[PDB]
Design a protein around this ligand. Structure first.
Ligand SMILES: OC[C@H]1O[C@@H](O)[C@H](O)[C@@H](O)[C@H]1O
Ligand SMILES: OC[C@H]1O[C@H](O)[C@H](O)[C@@H](O)[C@H]1O
Ligand SMILES: OC[C@H]1O[C@H](O)[C@H](O)[C@@H](O)[C@H]1O
Ligand SMILES: OC[C@H]1O[C@H](O)[C@H](O)[C@@H](O)[C@H]1O
Ligand SMILES: OC[C@H]1O[C@H](O)[C@H](O)[C@@H](O)[C@H]1O
Ligand SMILES: OC[C@H]1O[C@H](O)[C@H](O)[C@@H](O)[C@H]1O
Lengths: 149, 149
């Protein structure tokens, strides 16, 4: 299932910085208000809840920068071609968050409920309203879709 | 995906009372330690998180007895052949519970974390350790499996 990753508090979406159909390895993931095919994602299940968050246009997936199993707070989120267990996430559509295998979450850097366009996303352990995400239809940005199959 | 519904606190499983391969409509759902093909379930997605919890052997699905949209606390869980929106549940594999569309959860009657075989299950709004369930492989009762597809 293809979906948009929507920051719940702001309504902005996860994008590769620059919006390329083929971002280079280690391109940062940011929040931005635009909708287009280069901010579409899919989720590839690896082990029950755990899987890869895949940028549809390029096939690269979401990583903590440097590929840590236990990335520290403020580690940047990036896209990278590699597939390994340090790029595993769970798409928690009940609590509305995205958790890395190490137990921390994807946040907007700085934790704003209304981050401006091109705000970087990072790992952080905190849980609060400004780190919530919902997963929605590319044809209807208010319609939640099931990302697991 | 076929799975066992395992009460987390006790390790007992959801069964039709009596274990029939074709339980009559309104047969109660109980907790019991046995494993066999007549306590296998599947989840049929209807609307994102919402779907029907299907008894594999019979094709009947889980209902609150009486089929109310807002069943009160202590309403018995049963199997019934009917499909309608009052038989919609979400299988919350993040918080480890089963939620009815009306917002309440499946519980062991009376709330014991170590209830005896043939304990009835019921609707109740409370959240606590004794209403947690996990969804596991029929071939390995300790291995969580993804119920959504
Ligand atoms: O019947 C189920 C209920 O049993 C009560 O005794 C318990 O306090 C509730 O939280 C719920 O578990
Ligand atoms: O950084 C993300 C941003 O990149 C470019 O500016 C694109 O034009 C936008 O649509 C958006 O994808
Ligand atoms: O930035 C992410 C990137 O980090 C390191 O370079 C790892 O070796 C890669 O596999 C990838 O995880
Ligand atoms: O960078 C993310 C980080 O931003 C701020 O420091 C917030 O207080 C934290 O809760 C977290 O959201
Ligand atoms: O009530 C459930 C219970 O019913 C019968 O006793 C069966 O023999 C058991 O395996 C179990 O299914
Ligand atoms: O007990 C379950 C049963 O309850 C009532 O009889 C409803 O009308 C049926 O569809 C079914 O939901």
């Amino acid at each position: 299932t293809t979906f948009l990753i929507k920051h719940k508090a702001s309504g902005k979406f996860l994008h590769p910085y620059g919006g390329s159909s083929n971002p280079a390895n280690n391109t940062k993931l940011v929040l931005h208000s635009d909708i287009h095919e280069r901010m579409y994602f899919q989720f590839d299940v690896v082990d029950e809840r755990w899987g890869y968050i895949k940028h549809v246009a390029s096939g690269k997936i979401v990583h903590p920068y440097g590929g840590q199993a236990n990335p520290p707070n403020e580690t940047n989120m990036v896209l990278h071609q590699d597939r390994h267990d340090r790029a595993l996430f769970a798409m928690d559509f009940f609590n509305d968050n995205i958790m890395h295998k190490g137990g921390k979450y994807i946040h907007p850097k700085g934790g704003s409920p209304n981050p401006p366009n091109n705000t970087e996303t990072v790992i952080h352990g905190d849980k609060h309203a400004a780190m919530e995400f919902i997963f929605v239809s590319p044809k209807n940005k208010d319609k939640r879709v099931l990302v697991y199959a």
